[PDB]
Amino acid sequence: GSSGSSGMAESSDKLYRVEYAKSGRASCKKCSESIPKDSLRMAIMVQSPMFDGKVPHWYHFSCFWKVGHSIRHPDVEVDGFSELRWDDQQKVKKTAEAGGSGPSSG
């Protein structure tokens, strides 16, 4: 029964938000695992039927792509991107273009 503290201002209500995990609590809705701390993870804003509202869905660097969430310009569409370092920025780009980790099985 947390109390909570209001007072959050956001200029860009970006749907996605990528940032280095803060703790190992955030769960994943793709592999049903516990996202590791200090790991590159993404977020998705979806409307929950039970929460009758929008909730931040965290998805592993790959999981996010597994579901099938392609991104053309993750530099503006996806938040944090700009915050991320040069390396990461480029990495995310290479992936986004591919549109998937690689189901290459067998």
Binding site for Zn ion (CB under 5 A): 28, 30-31, 60, 63
Nearer to Zn ion, 31 or 76 (CB): 31
Q: Shortest gap between Cβ of 1 and Zn ion (angstroms)?
A: 29
Q: Shortest gap between Cβ of 72 and Zn ion (angstroms)?
A: 23
Closest CA to 56 of 22, 91, 89: 22
Nearer to Zn ion, 21 or 28 (CB): 28
- Residue 96 tokens, joined: 């986004």
Q: Shortest gap between Cβ of 62 and Zn ion (angstroms)?
A: 7
Closest CA to 31 of 46, 41, 45, 18: 41
- Rounded distance between C-alpha atoms, residue 11 and residue 32, angstroms: 32
Contact indicator for 79, 12 with CB cutoff of 8 Å: yes
Report DSSP state, residue 87: H
Nearer to Zn ion, 58 or 81 (CB): 58
Q: Shortest gap between Cβ of 19 and Zn ion (angstroms)?
A: 16
Nearer to Zn ion, 63 or 92 (CB): 63
